[PDB]
Amino acid sequence: QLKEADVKKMLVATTHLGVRNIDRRMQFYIFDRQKDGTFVFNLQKVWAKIVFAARILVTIDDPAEIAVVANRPDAQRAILKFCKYTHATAFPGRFIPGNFTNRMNPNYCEPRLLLVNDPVVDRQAILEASYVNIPTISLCNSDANLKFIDVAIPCNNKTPMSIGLIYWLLAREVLRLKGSISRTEEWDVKPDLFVALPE
């Protein structure tokens, strides 16, 4: 269920605005096009997808087996806070090929679930996961290729605020589902932490 506060936060975050391009596998999440040509997402669809992804995440008993990968400079802070609060594992910076197949790599691990922010910028890890029977969940913009993408979250992934907001909502939902916190009381953490800060 989507509440007025959530929709207003998403709207101020410009989460529903995409790109001029469109893919046939995302037309179900598109609600309208603007005069210039930018596509407009559907807030209920993305909310339901976030809920579904949070459920899937909580299905895993050990948070240490979840890997978060992001080469985007803006995402770094959001993914770091997401992992710190959820006690997961992060792969900031460049992703070294062989991190999942070469056991002699200094940074080599056997994750059970993989999370990505953009297939185009992190496609190297997606193939690696495909080599070792690892599902992946990614944030997909209007124009995305869903080759080996099990779950796609329809959202903006270029603006700094949208990236941080989505991770914050996901963390809130997973923590609530875990039973630590309740729905009625607003989370003490403010979304501003996940957003990158200049200087």
Binding site: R103, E110, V132, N133
Partner: protein, 209 residues
């Protein structure tokens, strides 16, 4: 000294948590350590064989650089077969690498009956076809007592896999040994991937493992 598991599956096999190889195959888990099988295959139930050894040269500024490529197969004669290759400056090292690779990759083989059903399965479940390079193979189930009608190279693979009745046909350039062995290996591998009316039963999935 002692074998130290370098993988989660390796550690689990170190413990008694996993009791059979079919428990690994049924989830398509890769095998990366030679111990994951020998612990399941301690006795000399399996058997190794060298098929072909070929020398390959690389022209350089002053003379040629020679090397050897080897092919090895392994099986227990009970629905298990493996095939691998290795290359090295020394023949023995190439043989060791090929044996390790053959041990690493292995697949179960499905066996069935020709017409009448009685006793243990003796021939392939149905028609199996394989491809590699220009070589194609056909395996047709045969009646009991028909033996193996195949070339000496392919017959060795069939015997290792544990099949006593089968009709074979080979097409293409069969004198290229590695491609023929690969074609038969792929045909055998495809066996546990064909749906039959006996497997139509709808089973609910289990959360455990």
């Amino acid at each position: 000294e002692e074998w130290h598991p370098s993988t989660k599956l390796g550690r689990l096999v170190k413990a008694g948590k996993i009791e059979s190889l079919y428990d690994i195959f049924k989830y398509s888990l890769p095998i990366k350590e030679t111990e994951i099988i020998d612990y399941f295959f301690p006795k000399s139930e399996l058997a190794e064989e060298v098929c072909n050894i070929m020398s390959v040269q690389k022209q350089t500024t002053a003379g040629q650089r020679t090397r050897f490529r080897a092919h090895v197969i392994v099986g227990n004669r009970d629905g298990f077969i493996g095939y691998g290759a290795g290359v090295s400056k020394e023949v023995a090292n190439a043989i060791k690498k090929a044996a390790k690779n053959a041990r690493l990759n292995i697949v179960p083989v499905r066996r069935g009956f020709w017409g009448g059903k009685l006793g243990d399965p003796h021939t392939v479940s149905s028609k199996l076809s394989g491809k590699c390079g220009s070589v194609r193979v056909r395996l047709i189930p045969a009646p009991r007592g028909a033996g193996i009608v195949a070339s000496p190279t392919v017959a060795k693979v069939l015997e290792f896999a544990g099949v006593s009745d089968v009709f074979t046909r080979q097409s293409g350039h069969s004198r290229t040994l590695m491609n023929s062995v690969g074609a038969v290996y792929n045909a055998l591998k495809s066996s546990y991937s064909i749906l039959t009316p006996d497997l139509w039963k709808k089973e609910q999935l289990d959360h455990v493992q």
